[PDB]
């Protein structure tokens, strides 16, 4: 059982390293152990199945049952396991599973399902997070992407502007916190400037979507 958590950590480190095949192998072994022990529905398999589906999505993306199909299966199982549990951690993990389902849908050229999954993730995130969370910006960005792919360019620029809006709100909140905090005078400004570096490419996406 401890080896399953070791496999999970190894797979996460491999995904961050960029060795997607090794990450897929480790996550697959961990998911196999958890499913053979607790059952392919129990709560202990949630994170394992989620990371398995995420690694399968990374594999499919690098390559550019099928990888996208198996990723959808694992992520939807994980989404079920998370949604059935009524805690904040589980709900945010279910939102992440929805986000990964939407990304798998984008890679599968199924943009309607992609916009549905991104909307579900955003609903969970907005009801369990604060209005200046970087995750909300990320989800709005993915949603605008899906809108642009689906030729809904008005909604695309709307979602991109919403991501910009939440980024700027977080910038203002962090400026307030760096002004009203004592002993942490640099991390907030560094994160502000990181978001400022992120902003212009989102504006370029706005322009590109306006171009259609």
């Amino acid at each position: 059982d401890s080896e399953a958590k070791k496999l999970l950590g190894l797979g996460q480190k491999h995904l961050v390293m960029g060795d997607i095949p090794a990450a897929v192998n480790a996550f697959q072994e961990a998911a196999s152990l958890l499913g053979k022990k607790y059952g392919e529905t129990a709560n202990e398999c949630g994170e394992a199945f989620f990371f398995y589906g995420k690694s399968l999505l990374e594999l499919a993306r690098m390559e550019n049952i099928g990888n996208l199909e198996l990723a959808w299966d694992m992520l939807d199982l994980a989404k079920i396991i998370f949604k059935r549990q009524e805690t904040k951690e589980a709900q945010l993990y279910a939102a992440q599973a929805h986000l990964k389902l939407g990304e798998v849908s984008v890679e599968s050229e199924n943009y309607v399902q992609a916009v549905e999954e991104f909307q579900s993730c955003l609903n969970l995130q907005e009801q369990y997070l604060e209005a200046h969370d970087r995750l909300l910006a990320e989800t709005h960005y993915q949603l605008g992407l899906a809108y642009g792919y689906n030729s809904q360019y008005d909604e695309a620029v709307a979602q991109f502007s919403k991501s910009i809006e939440v980024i700027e709100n977080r910038m203002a909140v962090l400026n307030e916190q760096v002004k009203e905090a004592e002993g942490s005078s640099a991390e907030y400004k560094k994160e502000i400037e990181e978001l400022k570096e992120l902003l212009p490419e989102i504006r370029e996406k706005i322009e590109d979507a306006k171009e259609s």
Partner: protein
């Protein structure tokens, strides 16, 4: 006289599975056929209206998209 259907029972089962349904009742087939007929009636009425306004004799995919935009769009949240 004519009970012409446009969708088959295997197709209904495949769509239910894509929706995530695990078990369907017997009346699900007739219910699904009825709702599909209502939807098609509304969309076809709007598309034929657009086509007859445009004074064309053949409804095109653009006519269909224009009619579909009139049906209303369901989102799974407010920020989307």
């Amino acid at each position: 006289r004519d009970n012409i259907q446009g969708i088959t029972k295997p197709a209904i089962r495949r769509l239910a599975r894509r929706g995530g349904v695990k078990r369907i009742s017997g009346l699900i087939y007739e219910e699904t056929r009825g709702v599909l007929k209502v939807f098609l009636e509304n969309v076809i009425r709007d598309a034929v209206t657009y086509t007859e306004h445009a004074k064309r004799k053949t409804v095109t995919a653009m006519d269909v998209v224009y009619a579909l935009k009139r049906q209303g769009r369901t989102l799974y949240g407010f920020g989307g």
